[PDB]
């Protein structure tokens, strides 16, 4: 029965270690992502949460019929 | 039997069948070519093959 239908304990043991490593990495990544999101939303120095500002290419830098602009 | 002969023909509407099968075949061929091009482009960028 063991030979025909099942495997040794090494296979399940090492598959369990692989699965545990994957899940632990995913957990630490989720916590890190939450912290990074909080920091970027608080500061705004990150790529994320960049709200638009007015493009300076719209400004007209020409004499304005009055020297004091 | 039918009193009137059911405008959807008793034979297949060969025009609709034709362009339906044609667009299915075209979509499949385009998807295969897109997949091959994506695989080659990805291998080219990442220095694999």
């Amino acid at each position: 029965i063991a030979r025909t239908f099942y495997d040794g304990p090494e296979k399940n043991y090492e598959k369990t270690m692989a699965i545990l490593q994957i899940e632990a990495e995913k957990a630490e990544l989720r916590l890190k992502e939450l912290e990074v999101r909080r920091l970027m939303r608080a500061r705004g120095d990150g790529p994320w949460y960049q709200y638009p500002t007015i493009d300076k290419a719209l400004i007209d830098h020409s004499p304005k019929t009055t020297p004091d602009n | 039997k039918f009193y009137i002969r059911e405008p959807p023909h008793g034979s297949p509407d060969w025009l609709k069948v034709g362009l339906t099968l044609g667009t299915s075949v075209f979509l499949w061929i385009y998807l295969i070519k897109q997949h091959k091009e994506d695989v080659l482009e990805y291998k080219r960028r990442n220095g694999l093959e």
């Binding site: 029965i1 063991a2 099942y6 304990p9 | -």
Partner: protein
């Protein structure tokens, strides 16, 4: 009409034993009935029940309980041959444990 609906009357129960005095209570068609009985009996009592119980009774000891008995025998033999307490109240060696230096 003194009624509320054009509703069918409630039909009476159809006794399966009437048209088939040996009816097995599976289907109205005797052939399908007999074969339903046969497949249920063969795949339930013959295949799953007996063969499955035999398979369960001869499952290999993956629970590792003869192994545990053998290990216990070896440790008891070794420990009693050397005048040892045969079991220690500390599951782990206290040397690899760093208790807080003070609780005062």
């Amino acid at each position: 009409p003194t009624i509320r609906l054009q509703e069918d009357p409630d039909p009476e129960d159809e006794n399966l034993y009437e048209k088939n005095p040996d009816s097995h209570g599976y289907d109205k068609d005797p052939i399908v009935d007999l074969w339903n009985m046969r497949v249920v009996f063969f795949f339930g009592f013959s295949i799953v029940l007996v063969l499955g119980s035999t398979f369960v009774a001869y499952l290999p000891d993956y629970r590792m309980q003869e192994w545990a008995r053998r290990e216990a025998e070896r440790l008891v033999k070794y420990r009693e041959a050397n005048g040892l307490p045969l079991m220690e109240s500390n599951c782990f060696d206290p040397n690899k444990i760093q208790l807080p230096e003070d609780e005062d």
